C-alpha cells in the first residue's frame, strides 16, 4: 500500500481540527496528529500463521500474511525538523 502525501492527510486533519475549534498545538497542528499517523501505520504488519488460521476459522492454514506500507512525505527545504516529518 502506497499512501501518497501523508502530509496532505495531516493538512486536511488540521483544517477539520481548527474548524472544530480544538486548541492548536505546535505549528498549528493538533496534538493528536502523531496518534493519527501512528495508528494508521501500525496496521502494516506481518502476522503469524496462527492469527491467520483463527481469522479464517481454519479455511487457510500454515500461511503468513503481510501488509507493506510506503508512505510519502514532502519536506519544504530538506527541513526534517517540521512537526509532521
Amino acid at each position: 500500500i502506497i499512501y501518497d502525501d501523508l502530509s496532505k492527510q495531516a493538512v486536511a486533519y488540521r483544517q477539520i481540527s481548527l474548524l472544530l475549534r480544538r486548541p492548536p498545538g505546535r505549528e498549528a497542528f493538533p496534538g493528536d496528529v502523531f496518534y493519527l499517523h501512528s495508528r494508521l501505520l501500525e496496521r502494516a504488519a506481518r502476522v503469524n500463521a496462527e492469527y491467520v488460521e483463527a481469522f479464517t476459522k481454519g479455511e487457510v492454514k500454515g500461511k503468513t500474511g503481510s501488509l507493506t506500507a510506503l508512505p510519502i512525505i514532502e519536506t519544504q527545504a530538506g527541513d526534517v525538523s517540521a512537526f509532521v516529518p
Partner: protein
C-alpha cells in the same frame, strides 16, 4: 425581509425569519444610500442569523437596514455575448458600451468535471522563449505557473506568452485580472483594441482598488466564462493575472468569519479553497483549456504555504529569481528550479531531453563551485573546473532574450526563436564549439548566429 444586525469590515450579519433562512452562497441585496449592494451568504449561524460578505464598499451601512433575499447565487453572463467586453465580478459591464446581449447566465459556484471526463494530451506547444520551452516546455491543454516575487517579470513574461500563443492560436481567450494594477488592465485593453484582436477576448477585472469580496469572487467569474467556452467544445486560453490575490482575499476575511488562524496566520481552509478553484481549470474530452497563471511569492519565500500549495496543482512551473533579475538577465528564469511534466524523453525525444539535463548538470556544478570561488577566487580551481565555469557563464548569458514587450524597456528589437535553434545552440555551447567567444557575445542574442555576429564586434 432580513435585518442587518452586525457590520464588521467586509462582513455583514443578517437575521431572517427562521422559516425563510437563505441557503449558502445565496445572493442578498441591500440598498446602501444611493446604490445597490449585493451580499453573498457564507455561513448559517444559529437562530436565523446568516453571515455574508459584501460585494462592494460596506461603509455607510447601518444596523437595521431591510435586506432582500434573492433566490439564487451570483449568476454571470456567458457565451459569445461576453466577447470583446470588460465585465465586473457581478457580471456587469464595466466598459462604457451598452448592456451585454446575454442569452444565458451561469452560477459562478460549480462542481469540477468528473474523473471519467478528463482527457490526456501530449501535444507540445511552442513558445518564442528559449529558456521556457527548453527547460520547462508545456503542452496544449496544460497548466503553466509563473512563480516570482515582486517586480521580477511575471506580467512581462505572461504578455510575451499572450503575444505568441494567443495570436498563433485561433480560438477564444479569457483574461482574468485578479487584484492587480488597474493601469495594466487599461494598457492591455487598448493594445488589444489597437490590434483588433479584442473581439476574441473576454476580460474580467477585479483589480486591487476593489474591496475584498470582489477580489475573492472574480476568479470564479472568469472560470465560469472559460467553462462556458470549453463546454461548447472549443479550445480556449485562460490567463489569470495573479492567483495569489484570491488566497489573500480569503485571508483578509477569514478572521472576521470567526475561523481560528493557521500556520503563518492563513485561513485553515487554504488548501481546500485553492483546490476547488484550481480543479475547475481542466481540459476535458469535450474541450480543452490552456492556462497560464502568475503566482506572486510573498517576501520571495518559496516555502510559504500559498506558493507551496500552488506547486502541486500545475503541470509546468517557471520560477523567477530576484538574484538573476538583479544581474539584468531577462527573463529571470531559474533553470535549476523550473521544471515541467513534459520534460520526458518519450514526449520531447532524446536530443531535447539530453540537452536539458546537460544544461542542468553544468549549472548545478557551477553552484557547487561558487562557494569555493567566493573565498579563494577562481585561480585555485582545477583546469577542468575552470572550463565548467567558463561554459556555465556562457549558458547563463545565452538564456537571455529580447522581448517585443521589452522593446520599450531595452530599446532593442524583440526576437522569436524556434526550438531547433535553442537545442542546437545549447548543445554547441556544451560541446565547446564556441569556447573561443567572449561571454558578452551571448548576452541578449536571439540565436547562436547572432552570438557569433555580436562576437565579431565584441
Amino acid at each position: 425581509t432580513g435585518k442587518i444586525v452586525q457590520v464588521i469590515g467586509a462582513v455583514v450579519d443578517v437575521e431572517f425569519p427562521q422559516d425563510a433562512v437563505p441557503r449558502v452562497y445565496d445572493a442578498l441585496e441591500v440598498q446602501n444610500g444611493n446604490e445597490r449592494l449585493v451580499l453573498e451568504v457564507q455561513q448559517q449561524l444559529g437562530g436565523g442569523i446568516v453571515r455574508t460578505i459584501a460585494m462592494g464598499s460596506s461603509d455607510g451601512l447601518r444596523r437595521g437596514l431591510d435586506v432582500k433575499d434573492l433566490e439564487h447565487p451570483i449568476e454571470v453572463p456567458v457565451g459569445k455575448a461576453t466577447l470583446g467586453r470588460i465585465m465586473n465580478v457581478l457580471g456587469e459591464p464595466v466598459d462604457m458600451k451598452g448592456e451585454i446581449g446575454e442569452e444565458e447566465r451561469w452560477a459562478i459556484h460549480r462542481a469540477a468535471p468528473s474523473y471519467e471526463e478528463l482527457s490526456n494530451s501530449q501535444e507540445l506547444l511552442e513558445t518564442g522563449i528559449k529558456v521556457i520551452d527548453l527547460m520547462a516546455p508545456f503542452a496544449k491543454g496544460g497548466k503553466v505557473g509563473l512563480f516570482g516575487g515582486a517586480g521580477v517579470g511575471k506580467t512581462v513574461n505572461m504578455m510575451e506568452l499572450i503575444r505568441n500563443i494567443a495570436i498563433e492560436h485561433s480560438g477564444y481567450s479569457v483574461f482574468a485580472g485578479v487584484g492587480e494594477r488597474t493601469r495594466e488592465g487599461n494598457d492591455f485593453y487598448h493594445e488589444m483594441t489597437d490590434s483588433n484582436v479584442i473581439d476574441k477576448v473576454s476580460l474580467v477585472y477585479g483589480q486591487m482598488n476593489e474591496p475584498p469580496g470582489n477580489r475573492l469572487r472574480v476568479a470564479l467569474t472568469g472560470l465560469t466564462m472559460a467553462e462556458k467556452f470549453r463546454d461548447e467544445g472549443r479550445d480556449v486560453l485562460l490567463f489569470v493575472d495573479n492567483i495569489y490575490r484570491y488566497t489573500l482575499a480569503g485571508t483578509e476575511v477569514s478572521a472576521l468569519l470567526g475561523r481560528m488562524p493557521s500556520a503563518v496566520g492563513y485561513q485553515p481552509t487554504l488548501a481546500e479553497e485553492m483546490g476547488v478553484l484550481q480543479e475547475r481549470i481542466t481540459s476535458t474530452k469535450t474541450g480543452s483549456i490552456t492556462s497560464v497563471q502568475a503566482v506572486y511569492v510573498p517576501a520571495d519565500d518559496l516555502t510559504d504555504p500559498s506558493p507551496a500549495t500552488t506547486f502541486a496543482h500545475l503541470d509546468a512551473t517557471v520560477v523567477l529569481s530576484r538574484q538573476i533579475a538583479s544581474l539584468g538577465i531577462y527573463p529571470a528564469v531559474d533553470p535549476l528550479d523550473s521544471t515541467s511534466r513534459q520534460l520526458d524523453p518519450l514526449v520531447v525525444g532524446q536530443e531535447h531531453y539530453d540537452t536539458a539535463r546537460g544544461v542542468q548538470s553544468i549549472l548545478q556544478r557551477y553552484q557547487e563551485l561558487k562557494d569555493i570561488i567566493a573565498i579563494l577566487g577562481m585561480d585555485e580551481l582545477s583546469e577542468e573546473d575552470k572550463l565548467v565555469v567558463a561554459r556555465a557563464r556562457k549558458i547563463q548569458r545565452f538564456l537571455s532574450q529580447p522581448f517585443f514587450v521589452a522593446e520599450v524597456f531595452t530599446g532593442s528589437p524583440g526576437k522569436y526563436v524556434s526550438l531547433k535553434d535553442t537545442i542546437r545552440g545549447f548543445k554547441g555551447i556544451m560541446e565547446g564549439e564556441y569556447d573561443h567567444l567572449p561571454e558578452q557575445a551571448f548576452y541578449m542574442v536571439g540565436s547562436i548566429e547572432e552570438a557569433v555576429e555580436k562576437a565579431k564586434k565584441l
